[PDB]
Enzyme design. Structure first.
Site, PDB file in Angstrom:
ATOM      1  CE  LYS A  23       0.617  43.482  46.192  1.00 60.49           C
ATOM      2  NZ  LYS A  23       0.009  44.705  46.807  1.00 60.49           N
ATOM      3  CE  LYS A  27       3.948  42.539  50.283  1.00 60.73           C
ATOM      4  NZ  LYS A  27       4.613  43.835  49.947  1.00 60.73           N
ATOM      5  CB  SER A  76       4.434  46.093  47.282  1.00 64.08           C
ATOM      6  OG  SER A  76       4.823  46.862  48.411  1.00 64.08           O
ATOM      7  CB  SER A 117       0.786  45.244  50.022  1.00 59.60           C
ATOM      8  OG  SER A 117       2.101  45.168  49.488  1.00 59.60           O
TER       9      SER A 117
HETATM   10  C1  MXR Z   1       5.105  47.731  48.667  1.00 58.16           C
HETATM   11  O1  MXR Z   1       5.507  48.442  47.758  1.00 58.16           O
HETATM   12  C2  MXR Z   1       4.948  48.230  50.090  1.00 58.16           C
HETATM   13  C3  MXR Z   1       3.512  48.513  50.571  1.00 58.16           C
HETATM   14  N1  MXR Z   1       2.647  48.412  49.439  1.00 58.16           N
HETATM   15  C4  MXR Z   1       1.998  49.423  49.195  1.00 58.16           C
HETATM   16  C5  MXR Z   1       0.951  49.392  48.224  1.00 58.16           C
HETATM   17  O2  MXR Z   1       0.181  48.341  48.211  1.00 58.16           O
HETATM   18  O3  MXR Z   1       0.793  50.307  47.451  1.00 58.16           O
HETATM   19  C6  MXR Z   1       2.394  50.606  49.974  1.00 58.16           C
HETATM   20  S1  MXR Z   1       0.948  51.493  50.440  1.00 58.16           S
HETATM   21  C7  MXR Z   1       0.535  51.652  52.128  1.00 58.16           C
HETATM   22  C8  MXR Z   1      -0.670  52.563  52.270  1.00 58.16           C
HETATM   23  N2  MXR Z   1      -0.507  53.288  53.540  1.00 58.16           N
HETATM   24  C9  MXR Z   1       0.929  53.458  53.730  1.00 58.16           C
HETATM   25  C10 MXR Z   1       1.320  53.313  55.157  1.00 58.16           C
HETATM   26  O4  MXR Z   1       1.784  54.258  55.738  1.00 58.16           O
HETATM   27  N3  MXR Z   1       1.198  52.140  55.740  1.00 58.16           N
HETATM   28  C11 MXR Z   1       2.120  51.714  56.759  1.00 58.16           C
HETATM   29  C12 MXR Z   1       0.171  51.178  55.431  1.00 58.16           C
HETATM   30  C13 MXR Z   1       1.607  52.372  52.913  1.00 58.16           C
HETATM   31  C14 MXR Z   1       3.244  49.940  51.020  1.00 58.16           C
HETATM   32  C15 MXR Z   1       4.549  50.684  51.068  1.00 58.16           C
HETATM   33  C16 MXR Z   1       5.470  47.159  51.024  1.00 58.16           C
HETATM   34  C17 MXR Z   1       6.933  46.855  50.863  1.00 58.16           C
HETATM   35  O5  MXR Z   1       5.311  47.684  52.313  1.00 58.16           O
END
Ligand code: MXR
Length: 367
Positions: A212, A46, A43, A109
């Protein structure tokens, strides 16, 4: 005695596969390990999406208050590719202010929010990825290529700790209004409160106005972090961190280490005279010499009074005409008698040729 003053500090071991620590103003690399290895950015992608958006708003191409209508491709639960990823949960037909969509991008994100803003800003996702990779070229990054607007795993997209640290520098410098969003700890959309997962925002020991976070099982734990102390600003990027707790602990180590052992100094500003040299064939006898860009140096902390500067000229004599910012030599900044950085010596004010004729003849010729 003086071994203290000339001491090089040991660099702490970093439980990350790639990292870099740079000064924001001076650009100096304080510490690095595998800073140019191509890795997946997750991410952190982004950051570039936000940079393109911030450039658009800077150019007046749209406003914070403009309402984007959500299309089918930004429908969170209508695209299973979004499964298990963070989303701000957008549905077709909503009209969401630009200010909320970019907060979904930066703070939550939200991958659906990237698609919403991409089509809005560039007409399509491919067009928007084209803007992203064009800004990769414009910034001279050498290990970065983007294939998505969100940073979901694309086979041909990659970056590096140095390139992501440089993207964060560009954000803070070029689009500061956009960058000022990353310090917000919380954002709510459609009755769902989500936290900025940059825990260093919560750390009182640092003044992290943060950038980020990013994490995929293939990237590891990525974080680009930025903090200030006074007017010194540092930027860290660690990629392939082991855990959420691990990547922030390691980033914090770099930022406190950098702050404790180095400081940034502004020894010369644009338009202030550094030196003065005779000029031949001119309406002025002397040229005022300095820099066309403010000098920021990163030196060992406390050693500012030991900083010495000198200069050399490219030619034996200066002949008019001389233009504003014409480069006539080099300024050498030395510590302990060794030159630690150079920057170009330029003319502060244009100096045309002599012309000593009757002011009226001059006019008369024109007339
Ligand atoms: C980016 O890397 C991905 C997206 N961004 C983050 C982040 O901001 O660290 C993760 S964290 C997120 C926290 N809870 C996890 C979950 O299971 N869901 C679905 C929210 C993930 C997350 C991977 C972007 C590509 O998705």
């Amino acid at each position: 005695d003086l071994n203290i003053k000339t001491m090089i500090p040991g660099v702490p071991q970093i439980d990350a596969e790639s990292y870099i620590l740079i000064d924001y103003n001076s650009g100096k690399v304080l510490a690095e390990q595998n800073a140019d290895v191509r890795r997946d950015p997750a991410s952190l992608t982004k950051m570039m999406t936000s940079y393109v958006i911030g450039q658009a708003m800077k150019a007046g191409k749209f406003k914070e208050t403009d309402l984007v209508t959500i299309g089918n491709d930004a429908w969170a639960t209508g695209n299973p590719v979004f499964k298990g990823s963070s989303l701000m949960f957008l549905k077709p037909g909503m009209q969401v202010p630009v200010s909320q969509l970019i907060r979904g991008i930066n703070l939550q994100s939200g991958n659906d929010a990237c698609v919403a803003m991409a089509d809005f800003a560039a007409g399509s996702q491919d067009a928007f990825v084209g803007l992203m990779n064009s800004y990769v070229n414009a910034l001279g990054l050498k290990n970065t290529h983007f294939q998505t607007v969100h940073g979901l795993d694309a086979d041909g997209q990659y970056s590096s700790a140095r390139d992501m640290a440089l993207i964060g520098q560009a954000l803070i410098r070029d689009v500061p209004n956009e960058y000022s969003i990353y310090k917000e700890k919380e954002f709510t959309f459609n009755g769902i409160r989500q936290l900025n997962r940059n825990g260093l925002l919560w750390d009182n020991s640092l003044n992290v106005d943060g950038i980020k976070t990013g994490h995929t099982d293939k990237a590891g734990y990525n974080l680009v972090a930025s903090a200030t102390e006074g007017q010194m600003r540092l930027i860290s990027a660690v990629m392939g961190g082991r855990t959420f707790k691990g990547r922030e602990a390691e980033s914090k180590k770099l930022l406190t280490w950098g702050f404790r052992f180095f400081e940034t100094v502004n020894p010369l500003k644009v338009g202030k005279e550094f030196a003065s040299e005779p000029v031949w064939f001119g309406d002025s006898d002397r040229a005022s010499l300095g820099v066309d860009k403010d000098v920021y140096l990163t030196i060992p902390r406390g050693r500012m009074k030991d900083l010495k500067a000198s200069y050399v000229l490219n030619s034996s004599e200066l002949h008019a005409p001389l233009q504003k910012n014409q480069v006539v030599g080099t300024i050498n900044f030395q510590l302990d008698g060794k030159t630690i950085e150079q920057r170009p010596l330029v003319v502060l004010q244009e100096i045309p040729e002599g012309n000593f004729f009757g002011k009226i003849i001059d006019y008369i010729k024109l007339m």
